[PDB]
Amino acid sequence: DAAIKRKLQSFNISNIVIKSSPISGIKTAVTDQGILYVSEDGKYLFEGKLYELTNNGPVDVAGKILVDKLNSYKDEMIVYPAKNEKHVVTVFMDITCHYCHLLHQQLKEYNDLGITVRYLAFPRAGMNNQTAKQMEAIWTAKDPVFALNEAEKGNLPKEVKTPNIVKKHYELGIQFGVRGTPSIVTSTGELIGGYLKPADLLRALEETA
């Protein structure tokens, strides 16, 4: 991993970070230009996308590289655990979205189907508005569940913070390909992005192991 990030610097490649590529001789170089792939040597770069069709289909190796990134935010997520979970899905949500709202009005149901809902923020209209500022407030509050539960009931925070964690959540969403909300990211890194009622959300999860 040592003899590498040198030539990459000399190729305008930022925040270089090496890793376990499912292909020896190479290392999954999670750079600021994307999830690259480089030789132990460091003379060949893949600015493409590495897969493995396994059986279900063209499953991108970086899918799992990405999921770790997300999970690594666990303590920023606004969790709504279930009696005892059978599923743990992360949802990208926006406070001004009817379906995100609806999905929220059913945490009890999702919870009661053994699905733990974990929220990450996804301010659609960019980080430049009262709305993106309210979510920062909500996500960093003293008790996010209360803050969020109240925002969903119409009580937005009067004061407000500057987008930061919501920004980090946003950017991670794009990496996943979030193009609207709500968007449910499976615990196996998948992505059934879009609203899905309790029941339906269950099958979708059970069907795809």
Place this chain on the structure above:
Amino acid sequence: DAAIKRKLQSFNISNIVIKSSPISGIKTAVTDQGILYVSEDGKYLFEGKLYELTNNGPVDVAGKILVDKLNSYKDEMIVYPAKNEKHVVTVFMDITCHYCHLLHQQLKEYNDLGITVRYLAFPRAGMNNQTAKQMEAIWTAKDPVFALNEAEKGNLPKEVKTPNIVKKHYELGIQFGVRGTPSIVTSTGELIGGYLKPADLLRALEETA
């Protein structure tokens, strides 16, 4: 190379053809979906693009895989050799193009600068018109140089054939990224696509070794 094209068939991948990838453990799989990269094993596919910045910059490995493809058409090219060549450039040309025309009116000059001009066809307005049919005729004639020399003087062939070799030349041009004519492809696989007077064409070639 044996234990490979099996899973690839089982991933809707046509005209599979393995090859020398500058990276062991893998093989430059020139498929009908593009120049892929696969593991000796055959469980991992790169549907991306492999490079090597060397020194001049991000030189694509498939550049050389491609050039061989082109060169492999040598006996279809309409050549205009020079006393004794110092350069051998392949030009994608169209008969209804002012600059392709102009470039042609100077074969003597290019020739006299030690540059052998080799023409491949590139019918821009697709293979569906009198023009694409005339070039097929020209490229497959009994003496293409005469046929072409005459087409450039305004004497197009009366009869006409159905696009085929011009088609193969066309498709190879797109692979190279030809977006207009003329487009000069260097002997080192490069691509200074666009008109370039004799002199200028020389430097461009000499500068880049």
